[model samples]
Target: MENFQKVEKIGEGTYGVVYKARNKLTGEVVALKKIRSTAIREISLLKELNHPNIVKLLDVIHTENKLYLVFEFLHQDLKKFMDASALTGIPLPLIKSYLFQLLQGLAFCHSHRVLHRDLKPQNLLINTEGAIKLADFGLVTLWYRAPEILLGCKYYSTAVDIWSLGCIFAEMVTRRALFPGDSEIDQLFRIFRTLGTPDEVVWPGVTSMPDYKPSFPKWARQDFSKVVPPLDEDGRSLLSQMLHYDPNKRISAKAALAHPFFQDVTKPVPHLRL
Candidate 1:
């Protein structure tokens, strides 16, 4: 903490406040996350993670009552970038690049057998170089939680994270949330409205879940083009697999990387600054 000079307050999260700071010796910029002693999950997971598409935890400073985490500074989050690109619309190639980086980060996490339970635009940090890094795991939320979790399934796996990734992918293309619900039930309902009401045929034994609802308006699967107009056939197909009602059928992060939608993009290059 003594080596870095606080530049400005940058953001806040479930565990603590983040500040843009500069190393007094090297004059390098960094993000300093201050957390109470009680919050440990974020530190534990971040320390174990080593991937280019994931935010790097550079150093950790411990005080008597607080923990300060040092990280490479990023320019903005995906939400802010999307908001700025709203009127002009994000180009297809750039969207593909961003989504590819996102999936790469997700693949790394899933491979490590760690679930990023909450994944949204706000959790994705983007640098000026067009790099995307997944951040914030200390605070999980119901907004992007999987259907199985919403249905009261206690024991789950990487499928839940994949579902959240699907939501983020759609949001990237559409420049809006695929399902922005205010409550748990409302969120599920919003999903059903787009993907169609789930039944035993689509999701075998779904009604057996503790929170499953037997009665709901039946909805036919809506066309993906209507939701994300710029998405091509390959992109829509992959999204369909990702957002599948059955977690078993949902695409895995690794498998999603192999999807045809990404055939044209082997790697992501920096896009023009927004």
Candidate 2:
């Protein structure tokens, strides 16, 4: 607190207030977030992360009754940027660059065996230079969660984040949410309606989930183009792999980085050394 000066409030939510601040000693601008006692998970996970496409946790300030986390300042999150750029959605090349960086970051997290349980447009930060970095790590609403977790599977892993990434990827293309459901069941049904209801062939252990029931309505998978109009064949194909019904079958972050969709993204974003 002695070395930094508060600039302005950036935003606030359940986590606490966030402010744009500057380091007086080094003259560096940073984001300062006040954390309640309940935010240990976010702090622990952030401290362990170091990558170009991930937000940098610069420092932590502790006092008798307060905890503040300092992060490198970012201009805007994807949600706000998309909303402001409404009529004309993000350009294809920029989309490619953003999604590539996203996957590259996720690949690094997967290598470290960390699962970002919550991921959406709001959790993706974009800088002035067009770099998109993943943000937020705490638990999220069931909408972005994977089917396995939605079905009450107690032990889940990286596949959950892959599902959320699929949703975010679709939104990136269309500038609209892929599935915006009111409740957990609605969310699951929305996914099933778009991708088709899964069977043993698609997700072998689905029936074993605690919440599994045989009464779900059958749905034929719609054409990917109809669902995500902005995507090309390769993009849709990659989306399909990421949103697979089976956790075991969903594409890994590392593998997704090698997909054909990114092959033409010649002008790679910096910090994407993978």
Candidate 3:
């Protein structure tokens, strides 16, 4: 393995520490992710995934018992883009395209029985080519033939990723993090406030979750309008479906691709052309 010139430390991730590096031989830029020896699954999974939306793992170099994953360079993450005041406030049409591309990438993953598990904006990468890629697939879980034993303690599936995407969608319009709950329970309630409590009639056996606990004072169905006044009725409707508390009822990535909110989005949008 060639040792590239180290540029700077990017940041810490749950799985590894990232560094900006330049290939000494090819003179190419890349993100050098150094993972611990124990995270074998993370390294293996990243190497297995190949999709435009998902971050691409190029090569692996081993040194001193730590594994370094070489990945294509990206300017910044969605969170950094949103954090920059000038870069904030995505146009409505752009949001559609972004969300659509995200769905396309996620659809490919789900089709392969890969559940991203984590789906916040920070995990999304935006390139100059308008490439919106899913980064950090180290948490991806394959659940095609899995048992019902609460994967990750919640019986998670692709639905968990959809919920995270819904949160990102809300963040795009509101320019604020959705469900900014202090605790896990608070987070569920914040979601409930906008989407309403889970109903057994709508989603059976939601109470069966290992950690299932009710919040929100046991209210009846509530209107999405009261929660998200800024979003259009159509937008709110789509958002609510996505953020469904019951994983079973949450909209699938493929179905969401055809939703009305994406009517204006162009597949692999023209502007994305280099």
TM-score of each candidate? 0.89, 0.89, 0.83
Clashing pairs in 2: none
Ranking by lDDT: 2, 1, 3
lDDT of 3 by residue, 169-215 (tens): 87788787756766454555555565556567766776666656555
Better candidate number, 1 or 3, judged by TM-score: 1
Per-residue lDDT tens digits of candidate 1, residues 1-274? 7888888998777878999999989989998888882346556656878889888888778788677888888888877877878887777787788888888888888777777777778888876665788886643356687889888998878898788887887887777877788888888888888778989899998989999866777788887778878788998898889888888888888888888888788444544464
Sort the candidates on TM-score, descending order.
1, 2, 3
Error of 3 at 229 (Å): 2.8
What is residue 130's positional error in candidate 1, in angstroms? Answer: 2.8
Q: Can you tell me which runs of candidate 3 are displaced by over 4 Å? A: 37-42, 86-88, 140-154, 213-216, 267-274
**How would you encode candidate 2's per-residue C-alpha lDDT over 79-150 as one tens digit per residue?**
787777679776788878888888899889888877788787777887655578887566435667788888
Residue 90, model 2, lDDT: 69
